[PDB]
Amino acid sequence: SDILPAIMTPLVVLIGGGAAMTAFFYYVER
Amino acid sequence: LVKHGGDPLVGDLATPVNSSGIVKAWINNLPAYRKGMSANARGLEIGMAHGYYLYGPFATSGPIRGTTMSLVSGVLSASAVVIVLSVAIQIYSSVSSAKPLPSVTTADPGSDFGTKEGWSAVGSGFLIGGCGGAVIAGVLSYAIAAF
Amino acid sequence: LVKHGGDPLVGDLATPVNSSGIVKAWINNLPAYRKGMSANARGLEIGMAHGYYLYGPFATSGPIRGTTMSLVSGVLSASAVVIVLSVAIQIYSSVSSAKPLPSVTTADPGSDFGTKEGWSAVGSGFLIGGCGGAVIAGVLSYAIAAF
Amino acid sequence: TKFPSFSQDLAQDPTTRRIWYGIATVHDFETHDGMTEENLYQKIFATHFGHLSIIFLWSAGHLFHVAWQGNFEQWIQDPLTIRPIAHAIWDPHLGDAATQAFTQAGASGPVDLCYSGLYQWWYTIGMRTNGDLYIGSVFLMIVAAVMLFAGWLHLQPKFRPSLAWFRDAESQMNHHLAVLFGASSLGWTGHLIHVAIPEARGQHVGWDNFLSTMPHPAGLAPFFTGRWGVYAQNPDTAGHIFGTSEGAGTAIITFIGGFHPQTEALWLTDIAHHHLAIAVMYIIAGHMYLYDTYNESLHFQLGFHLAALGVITSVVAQHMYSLPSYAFISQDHVTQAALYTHHQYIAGILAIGAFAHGGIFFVRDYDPERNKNNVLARALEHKEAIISHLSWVSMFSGFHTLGVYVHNDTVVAFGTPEKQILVEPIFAQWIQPFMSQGPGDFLVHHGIAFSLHVTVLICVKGCLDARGSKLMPDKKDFGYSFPCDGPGRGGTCDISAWDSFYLAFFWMLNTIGWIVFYFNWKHLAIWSGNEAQFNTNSTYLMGWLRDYLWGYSAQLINGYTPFGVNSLSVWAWIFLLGHLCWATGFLFLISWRGYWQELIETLVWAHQRTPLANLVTWKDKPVALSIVQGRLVGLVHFAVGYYVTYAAFVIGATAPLG
Amino acid sequence: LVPCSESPKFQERAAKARNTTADPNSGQKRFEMYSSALCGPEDGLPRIIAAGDFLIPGLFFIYIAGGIGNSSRNYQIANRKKNAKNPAMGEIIIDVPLAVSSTIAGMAWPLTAFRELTSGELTVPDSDVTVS
Amino acid sequence: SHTVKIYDTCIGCTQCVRACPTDVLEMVPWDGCKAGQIASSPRTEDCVGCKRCETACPTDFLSIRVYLGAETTRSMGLAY
Amino acid sequence: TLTGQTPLFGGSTGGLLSSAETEEKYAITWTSPKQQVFEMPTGGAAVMNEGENLLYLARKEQCLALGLRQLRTKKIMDYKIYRVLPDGSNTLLHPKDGVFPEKSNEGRAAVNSVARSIGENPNPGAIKYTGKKAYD
Amino acid sequence: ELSDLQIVIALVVALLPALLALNLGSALS
Amino acid sequence: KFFSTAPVIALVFFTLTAGFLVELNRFFPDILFFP
Numbered sequence A: 001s002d003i004l005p006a007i008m009t010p011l012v013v014l015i016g017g018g019a020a021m022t023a024f025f026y027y028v029e030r
Numbered sequence B, C: 001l002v003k004h005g006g007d008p009l010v011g012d013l014a015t016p017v018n019s020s021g022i023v024k025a026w027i028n029n030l031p032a033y034r035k036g037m038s039a040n041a042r043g044l045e046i047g048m049a050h051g052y053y054l055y056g057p058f059a060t061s062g063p064i065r066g067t068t069m070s071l072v073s074g075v076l077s078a079s080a081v082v083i084v085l086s087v088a089i090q091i092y093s094s095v096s097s098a099k100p101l102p103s104v105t106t107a108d109p110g111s112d113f114g115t116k117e118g119w120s121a122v123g124s125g126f127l128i129g130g131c132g133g134a135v136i137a138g139v140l141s142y143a144i145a146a147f
Numbered sequence D: 001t002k003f004p005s006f007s008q009d010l011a012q013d014p015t016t017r018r019i020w021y022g023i024a025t026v027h028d029f030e031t032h033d034g035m036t037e038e039n040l041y042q043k044i045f046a047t048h049f050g051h052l053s054i055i056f057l058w059s060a061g062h063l064f065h066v067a068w069q070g071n072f073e074q075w076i077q078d079p080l081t082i083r084p085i086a087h088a089i090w091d092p093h094l095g096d097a098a099t100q101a102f103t104q105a106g107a108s109g110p111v112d113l114c115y116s117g118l119y120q121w122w123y124t125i126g127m128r129t130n131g132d133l134y135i136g137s138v139f140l141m142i143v144a145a146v147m148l149f150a151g152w153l154h155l156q157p158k159f160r161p162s163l164a165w166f167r168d169a170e171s172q173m174n175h176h177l178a179v180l181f182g183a184s185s186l187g188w189t190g191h192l193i194h195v196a197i198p199e200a201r202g203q204h205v206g207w208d209n210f211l212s213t214m215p216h217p218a219g220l221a222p223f224f225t226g227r228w229g230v231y232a233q234n235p236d237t238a239g240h241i242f243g244t245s246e247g248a249g250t251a252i253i254t255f256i257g258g259f260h261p262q263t264e265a266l267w268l269t270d271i272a273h274h275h276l277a278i279a280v281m282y283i284i285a286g287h288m289y290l291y292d293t294y295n296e297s298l299h300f301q302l303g304f305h306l307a308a309l310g311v312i313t314s315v316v317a318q319h320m321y322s323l324p325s326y327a328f329i330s331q332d333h334v335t336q337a338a339l340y341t342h343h344q345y346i347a348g349i350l351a352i353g354a355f356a357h358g359g360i361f362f363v364r365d366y367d368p369e370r371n372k373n374n375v376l377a378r379a380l381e382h383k384e385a386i387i388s389h390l391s392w393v394s395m396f397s398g399f400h401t402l403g404v405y406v407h408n409d410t411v412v413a414f415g416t417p418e419k420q421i422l423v424e425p426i427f428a429q430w431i432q433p434f435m436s437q438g439p440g441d442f443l444v445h446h447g448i449a450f451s452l453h454v455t456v457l458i459c460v461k462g463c464l465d466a467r468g469s470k471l472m473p474d475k476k477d478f479g480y481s482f483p484c485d486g487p488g489r490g491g492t493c494d495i496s497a498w499d500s501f502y503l504a505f506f507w508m509l510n511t512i513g514w515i516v517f518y519f520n521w522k523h524l525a526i527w528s529g530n531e532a533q534f535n536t537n538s539t540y541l542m543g544w545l546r547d548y549l550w551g552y553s554a555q556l557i558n559g560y561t562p563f564g565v566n567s568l569s570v571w572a573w574i575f576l577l578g579h580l581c582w583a584t585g586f587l588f589l590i591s592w593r594g595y596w597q598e599l600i601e602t603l604v605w606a607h608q609r610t611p612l613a614n615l616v617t618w619k620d621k622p623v624a625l626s627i628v629q630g631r632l633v634g635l636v637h638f639a640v641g642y643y644v645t646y647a648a649f650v651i652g653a654t655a656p657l658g
Numbered sequence E: 001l002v003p004c005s006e007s008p009k010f011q012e013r014a015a016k017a018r019n020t021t022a023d024p025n026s027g028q029k030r031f032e033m034y035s036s037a038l039c040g041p042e043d044g045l046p047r048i049i050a051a052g053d054f055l056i057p058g059l060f061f062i063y064i065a066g067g068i069g070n071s072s073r074n075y076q077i078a079n080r081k082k083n084a085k086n087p088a089m090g091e092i093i094i095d096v097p098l099a100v101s102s103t104i105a106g107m108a109w110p111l112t113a114f115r116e117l118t119s120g121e122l123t124v125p126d127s128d129v130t131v132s
Numbered sequence F: 001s002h003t004v005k006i007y008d009t010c011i012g013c014t015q016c017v018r019a020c021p022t023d024v025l026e027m028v029p030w031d032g033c034k035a036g037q038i039a040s041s042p043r044t045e046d047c048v049g050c051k052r053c054e055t056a057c058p059t060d061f062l063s064i065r066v067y068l069g070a071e072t073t074r075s076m077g078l079a080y
Numbered sequence G: 001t002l003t004g005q006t007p008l009f010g011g012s013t014g015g016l017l018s019s020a021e022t023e024e025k026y027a028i029t030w031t032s033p034k035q036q037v038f039e040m041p042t043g044g045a046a047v048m049n050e051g052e053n054l055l056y057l058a059r060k061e062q063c064l065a066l067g068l069r070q071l072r073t074k075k076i077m078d079y080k081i082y083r084v085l086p087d088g089s090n091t092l093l094h095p096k097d098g099v100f101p102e103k104s105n106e107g108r109a110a111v112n113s114v115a116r117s118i119g120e121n122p123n124p125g126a127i128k129y130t131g132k133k134a135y136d
Numbered sequence H: 001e002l003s004d005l006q007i008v009i010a011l012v013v014a015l016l017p018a019l020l021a022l023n024l025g026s027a028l029s
Numbered sequence I: 001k002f003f004s005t006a007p008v009i010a011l012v013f014f015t016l017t018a019g020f021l022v023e024l025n026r027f028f029p030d031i032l033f034f035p
């Protein structure tokens, strides 16, 4: 779990940010 | 070639740039507008064109450029961008009600953009096209380099 | 969070696992169930997800593992599995009449599964998605390994 | 469109204003559609559990990261040369040069140096291994789990507290004083005596052996009988090294005074004594224990509590550098500058927040009939007077301070520094941990005085004129935040009370900026040994520009050069990010809505008329941000910029020096 | 903190001095004058302590400020008594006779202040003072 | 939309109504004042909020007061 | 059915956008003595034809700006403003009574007239959680 | 010095407030 | 009339006050504190 940074960071920033932005988009556009 | 206003009260001016024959020919026959395409087809062509185009900036300009791995960057980057656009199409369509309105350039836009069905079709197209585009451009880059 | 029976005569208990909000949110928005997707799109997402997942066991665990050829095994294996599932969808749809029934978790399943049209669409999606998934996962495995 | 659920006015807005105003009003529960005071208090109640869960997961992150990625162990071994570490950097964008440069404090990979004195604080309170931290972290995640569980359970109607439990504020006040403050204070003395002080004296206390261990040999016998003497045992020798047996005393409660010489910090024993005393006083006062308005208005309550936390955090900053209570934090200059500047800026935010909610009170909650002749009624009775006086002391202090600084600049420029109006701070000498207050210190103190005056001038002209004025007699009608009353009466831009919070945030930043500027320049001077530099050059403003800003910038801005990166690269960059953010604030503060609304009209045209692009359209008609949103985004940029720039500069100034 | 004479830094400053006025001796004259005041040992720069330093020039300043304030006030009274409409050619255009009379009655404000304070002539009732 | 409320002290100068660019305001007959008129605001779904009305009103504590809320296409003044 | 001749205008970009179709146009119809030239509110110069002229504009303020500033200046006070929905519902707005709102006419109620003067409006403190505004 | 077992447990614990935050957030909406 | 007007009146007055203070400073040396 030295690599956990290289997984957690893209997951949270890119994937989570993406999913968050998508969800907030649905939320404010529905 | 002169500027004139079709329906003068509407805020659009037919110009040699929006209403010319050569232009109308090109615009109205691009896969967004071209008549008699399945939405999926519209998307597959738009996708392929963009994926293929998108490969280049990424492969050429990015951080690992020059190296062999640049081709892989190019393809994955272009495909990532296409996946993000695929998401954009899905979420757009999810919340979109609006239909493409007839314009000076395109008298009959169509329904493929303007129905949730249409956009889903277009997006499925666009995704497959785009990632295909990007892969094809990397394959061709490797091909031409080798040859 | 308590167990209760919607339509108590039906053999379906609402539980925190089948009727919770977080769960209903997830399940009803998975591409099987998500509203406003073309069947093709449903399939393309299900496919991509599974192809991409399927690459891993095959590449990691199979007989030629560790070697470079393992990535190719992974992709072809996952794609083979997807082709077999594609066959399964076609033959299933061929002989299927049954429609997804409304359940506790999914009040409006939809028609994309439940019409021969829907399943053919989904299968075309699923195939392209799955083999794409598998290829993408091999491409990314090569990419990350190189980087 | 559904969002925002709570406000139909907005939800039916066909524009992008609906999304912005939604997010802006999403926590003004009072103004939500069909919000009864009962539901209001219940909602508020649950939110607070959310906030606290956040604070705990925040703390949790601190401990988790320092455990996993920190150098806390290596640091406890060499706490004066090892740079303590905040967390790992994983950033795919770093070049090899920058990974090398951020590979610091003997870390395998790229790290961020910590500058919150968290290492010092944890060493002081006894933590000595990554295990202690990891357990703190997992514990605090579980605490947050509990606090979240709590807010959930509470909002559930089973345990939904009715208006009663909140109407009982007096009970809550007494409880806060004793059951919370007093209890936790002596509990903390518990921790100190049982774990902090032992571990300080080189004796390991775990959770499994403190039941075994007794803090004081004479402990039980002293307890309840002759407690004062036994507790004051052999005091720790000056020889004593922190976390070693060498010179270890046995006293657990003392009044030794001054600072432990090894760590240059307040004696743990003195702190334990302090807390025991504080606990006794608090519990006693609890047992022992504007009324109308304070209970009526939650705005009055927050306002009061913000003004409170304002002064408290100011004094925390003022005391935590003069009277260091953490081991080795006095020697870690960057951390001490960082913490002072941090807490002072948070002080200024909490202060101005006080006056903000003040004005909100005066436009939402204050009934003039309800309180016939209260303090507040008298305050409004002669607004023109309170304002004229604050105005006068502002113009006075201002004219003279600026005049003197400008006089000094002029004569020093003309090469006759003799002629400077150097005024000695006599009263400062009389009162005087305390550093030499010269004529520089005098002038800066008056600067800060003046600026704090103008700040309160503004954020009271705000909360007083909120109800109205000759220019707008009935402001209470339009409320706290609204653009203007239009160009009607010579023009009414920025006439709202919110506008006064906006205009006063600038002064708050100016004031705290002068405060932390003075702090940091003084301290950099002493920490370089050139206290002469401060003393000689602090009397004219070119000295501040040349010696403070110009002079201490060099390291920071060389963080990255064409020649290469060093560890200060990330700070040089943040420094610029803050300049950019600040300046971006000027875009919104200076250019006002109409310019933009015309421009955006043309972009709406271009979009609708562009083939291929026209296929997609907005759901929400694009509009320029609102008048007030312009002011707000302006201010948030200006503020964020201000803070980020100065934080970068504080770190980059102090770090190379040490 | 110590007489400038005593302070060795001040003597250094005195040796090499910049002449403000045309006359060569302005620098030396300035330092000689400044010798009286107390100056900090390290700096050797004259300091100001809150009677000669601040109180006396404070008094002079206040006299002049009171003079100019009083003169303006007197001229305002002259404005509101000279004509039915005070502003028009009463403020924009300055009546030199009224102004010079106001100035002459100015600088007598210290004696005048006692009379003004008596019966609160200067202050106008809160009731009268226009405040929304 | 913006609520336009006309208060007791309307001296019926007809200044507001001539100001309003979306003609929200109609000068109606009223026995309350010497003017014989008052200001009425029927068409407040067309109130942009310019407050040219308030700007034109000459009464101290102007009778015409516009109160901005629930912005619509017609308030926000959108061609598009 | 709101029939007139469109003023001779070469076309602009200042005109109706998608909202004209999607939501609601407006139309100003006026009687011109002469074929004179007037500033188009969209930007430009158009020449009103002899007699009834019909102009489709995008908001009421555009219509009432042509009318109040230019037509009324040319002494043309025959202009009528119609909200036009997509279905073709033409609804006379501006002279709803047939008389300019500045001139007092009967059968026009006092709307949003407030009894109490500005001074006497209630404080919000009092009315907190009633859902009544100060002006209301 | 911090072992993988510990990193995992920390994550699994942190998952608990995550679920409960989702729950409380839902409630407050 | 021109003399009455603020701009000219003030111009003369301040060109006098400024010159007066300049002249004072010209004659008397740098005065930091009252002697």
Ligand code: CL7
Pocket: B054, B057, B058, B059, B061, B062, B063, B064, D093
């Ligand atoms: C976030 C801070 C940042 C900023 C503001 C920034 N960069 Mg970089 N940045 C670049 C350019 C750039 C530009 C032009 C630019 C201007 O705004 C910026 N950047 C700005 C490239 C050199 C580089 C590549 C990024 C890269 O490849 O991105 C993809 C680029 C694409 C998809 C856009 C191409 C635009 C089209 C050509 C437009 C075509 C018009 C056409 C006529 C229309 C008609 C068509 C038809 C009808 C005829 C990049 C980097 C890179 C990074 C990173 C981290 C950054 N950046 C960072 C930034 C790479 O690693 C990476 C790095 O490795 O650097 C070498």
Ligand code: CL7
Pocket: C054, C057, C058, C061, C062, C063, C064
């Ligand atoms: C036919 C006799 C046979 C049997 C009974 C058998 N193997 Mg093998 N077998 C394996 C395991 C195995 C298991 C676990 C298993 C148990 O029944 C068996 N086998 C059994 C692997 C070691 C290996 C790999 C085969 C290979 O990788 O197959 C693919 C594995 C896959 C697609 C299944 C993975 C299952 C998922 C992970 C389930 C996860 C679900 C998830 C929790 C749900 C939630 C998801 C989300 C919502 C969160 C294999 C071999 C292999 C062979 C061969 C010939 C065999 N076998 C043979 C057999 C390989 O060459 C090949 C050889 O190379 O060996 C190294």
Ligand code: CL7
Pocket: C083, C084, C086, C087, C088, C090, C091, C127
């Ligand atoms: C049984 C009716 C049928 C016929 C007659 C037929 N296919 Mg298909 N068929 C293909 C080829 C093909 C060829 C070259 C061919 C005639 O020459 C046919 N087929 C003909 C491949 C391109 C393609 C994938 C490979 C394919 O399945 O096998 C390759 C084809 C072979 C060697 C030629 C023999 C002709 C067989 C009668 C087809 C066998 C299909 C069978 C149902 C599945 C067998 C097991 C399978 C998992 C491999 C295919 C599909 C597929 C299906 C299905 C259901 C079919 N088929 C069905 C048929 C997939 O979904 C599946 C699908 O992925 O596509 C949508």
Ligand code: CL7
Pocket: A004, A005, A006, A008, A009, A012, A013, D053, D054, D055, D057, D058, D059, D060, D061, D062, D064, D065, D087, D088, D089, D090, D141, H010, H011, H012, H014
């Ligand atoms: C599981 C325990 C954990 C906690 C409590 C925690 N982190 Mg980390 N975390 C970071 C910040 C952080 C903050 C600000 C924070 C404070 O709340 C925490 N963390 C807290 C960044 C330093 C870095 C960014 C990558 C990234 O963020 O990693 C994922 C982090 C996760 C799984 C922890 C989630 C738990 C937090 C309690 C959630 C806080 C929510 C907040 C209270 C609600 C309000 C939102 C607010 C925006 C308004 C990071 C790391 C990282 C990890 C890991 C494993 C963690 N963490 C773990 C944790 C990276 O690999 C990775 C690391 O290795 O980087 C090298």
Ligand code: CL7
Pocket: D023, D024, D025, D026, D027, D028, D029, D302, D306, D349, D350, D352, D353, D354, D356, D357, D360, D480, D481, D498, D501, D636, D640
């Ligand atoms: C800054 C001074 C201030 C403080 C400290 C403060 N308030 Mg208020 N405050 C509230 C409560 C409150 C609480 C519980 C509280 C706790 O202490 C405070 N406040 C405190 C609610 C009653 C009410 C609800 C507010 C409101 O509804 O909140 C929603 C607003 C939100 C979601 C957006 C906020 C965005 C931030 C501004 C910008 C953050 C920048 C970020 C760092 C990114 C940087 C990038 C990177 C480089 C780091 C509120 C009011 C309001 C104001 C104002 C001006 C304030 N406040 C001011 C303050 C309203 O007008 C407003 C009001 O509605 O008045 C009529």
Ligand SMILES: CC1=C(C/C=C(\C)CCC[C@H](C)CCC[C@H](C)CCCC(C)C)C(=O)c2ccccc2C1=O
Pocket: A024, A025, A028, D019, D587, D588, D589, D591, D592, D593, D594, D596, D623, D624, D625, D626, D627, D629, D630, D631
């Ligand atoms: C620049 C500027 C603008 C224009 C700026 C605007 C309209 C903001 C521009 C949009 C920004 C870039 C973000 C909007 C787009 C995001 C992509 C939205 C994401 C969130 C969605 C899910 C809602 C103003 O409107 C304005 C108003 C008043 C005073 C000053 C100014 C001002 O300075």
Ligand code: SF4
Pocket: D483, D484, D485, D486, D487, D488, D491, D492, D493, D494, D592, D627
């Ligand atoms: S905020 Fe803008 S609209 Fe309002 S008064 Fe100021 S300039 Fe006019």
Ligand code: SF4
Pocket: F006, F009, F010, F011, F012, F013, F014, F015, F016, F017, F038, F039, F056, F057, F058, F059, F062, F063, F064
């Ligand atoms: S509110 Fe003013 S403009 Fe309107 S009718 Fe009354 S006096 Fe005339």
